[PDB]
């Protein structure tokens, strides 16, 4: 038993991290088959990022201006192209560590693991969520750009995130592996508005179910509610609205615990209106929204990968 | 910027996890050079666990009574031996994936990454602390035994923990890689008492320094205290005593932030008696004690490994 914020094992991703250098700028790239992917602002100086013309900056660059290093190995660059906000390098050698992989654009509220990297070398792994306003609250210092987020299904790595930007507010923004930003952000050093950040309601409910499975039950109440009644409360507390698709996803947890989804919504409603009275749930004094219903099921059945 | 509970990259350890079966009981083992390590209770049935005589139970067994699977390949056991509470299996093949490694017995309050495993396959990775009462609060379902905890220093994996036991209270207990239990626990399915758990004070202070570095400063004040009066308040709230060794450890964080250790303790003293109201620190409503001072420095300067 017990419940932890768990990341996927990162071995398959470590073998794809490389260092990309262009002039004075070095950041992380992703080496799969014979292509290397990296944020396009590798071609920028600090002064360029205030207002970069990426097409005009890239035209000054040839294949040999890009230094791609995998461990101690130099890769030979034999072609380059810009796809949205990522650069793709055709190299001499296919990565022999290439796992089975897919590229995926995830939805707000989904979770993924982040392998934070500096100079092509892994530093740490953690789990996090795509917020409803398409930012993530990560841990990224200077040089972490090009670090990637992923999920794993058995033997297949689903890449869903490449880090590009810290916003002046301190939250983080990036792209999918086709180089399209999540959200309205651009790769430019300017003030950029993220939306109001709301709480991922279906995830909070999944974690309440996890709590009941682990013996933590003080918040279960004598009330029920309706979807429309709950959503009126949800809107007041900046919770995302709950839909029947969400109720359906929670089905298996409902069946295991014997607690109907609308009954657990009434417990959540009462927690939103009355607070937690200084009490804790699964060791947390706040309502946690970084576990998907799938995350909760995985942890409570012990699903592996290798 | 940003601050997260990061685990070490787990690739070096994933390549050492095997599956060990003995009759009806399967758990995880660690394959280093030509040896597989695993908990000795793999030779127990559920009934045996109530009162095992391990020497007698092991004598009933021979080198071929053991069943070691690595991925799909079967390993050939040519020998076995019992070192304290671990079994040492001599196999035919040295693990070609053996990393540079060390066995280490850690101290209470130190932290490590756990690779949670089932049937020899990694499921997830998370960071945790050895509590002052020598338990850990992990996420361990049936079959996770033999999962290991580790740290990484550049290129050398320091193995410090192997999971053995879930206590009746739902916390976890295990050994070092020589098979000596942390704490007063034994590999027998009985009621077992763990000490009163205290909060790791030096870690809470480290995390407050992390919060300042990251722009969260509201809890600061121009009060003070000496070491001796802080400790009067410290327990009274079940906090571990602070020693000069601890003040010395926090020196570099003190120098980076311009906040004297004793002044940070005076901020903690104030926090313990009035709470945090509805206010948070680094997104948390409680005081966090699973970051060591070394953890904070690692994350804030971006130390890599590869």
Residue numbers in the entry:
A (entry chain A), B (entry chain B): 1 to 306
Study authors write:
Crystal structures of 11 Mpro mutants provided structural insight into their altered functionality. We employed crystallographic structural analysis together with a high fidelity FRET activity assay by our group to assess the functional and structural changes in Mpro mutants. The crystal structures of several variants revealed the changes in side chains orientations of residues in the active site comprising substrate binding pockets, especially S2 and S4, which might lead to altered amino acids preferences. Accordingly, changes in KM values for most of variants were observed, indicating alterations in a mode of substrate binding. We observe the highest level of conformational plasticity around the S2′ and S3′ binding pockets with N142 and S46 being the most flexible residues within the structures we solved. Also, we observed that the charge distribution in the active site changes quite dramatically even upon a single substitution especially around the S3′ and S2 binding pockets. This might explain why with most mutants we see the changes in binding affinities and not the kcat values.
SARS-CoV-2 Mpro is a cysteine protease that forms a dimer composed of two protomers. Each protomer comprises the chymotrypsin and 3C-like peptidase domains I and II (residues 10–99 and 100–182, respectively), with the active site consisting of a Cys145-His41 catalytic dyad located in the cleft between the two antiparallel-β-barrel domains. Mpro cleaves the polyproteins at 11 positions with a consensus cleavage sequence Leu Gln | (Ser, Ala, Gly) to release nsp’s, which are required to assemble the viral replication-transcription complex. In addition to the indispensable role in viral replication, SARS-CoV-2 Mpro also plays an essential role in escaping antiviral defense by cleaving host cell proteins.
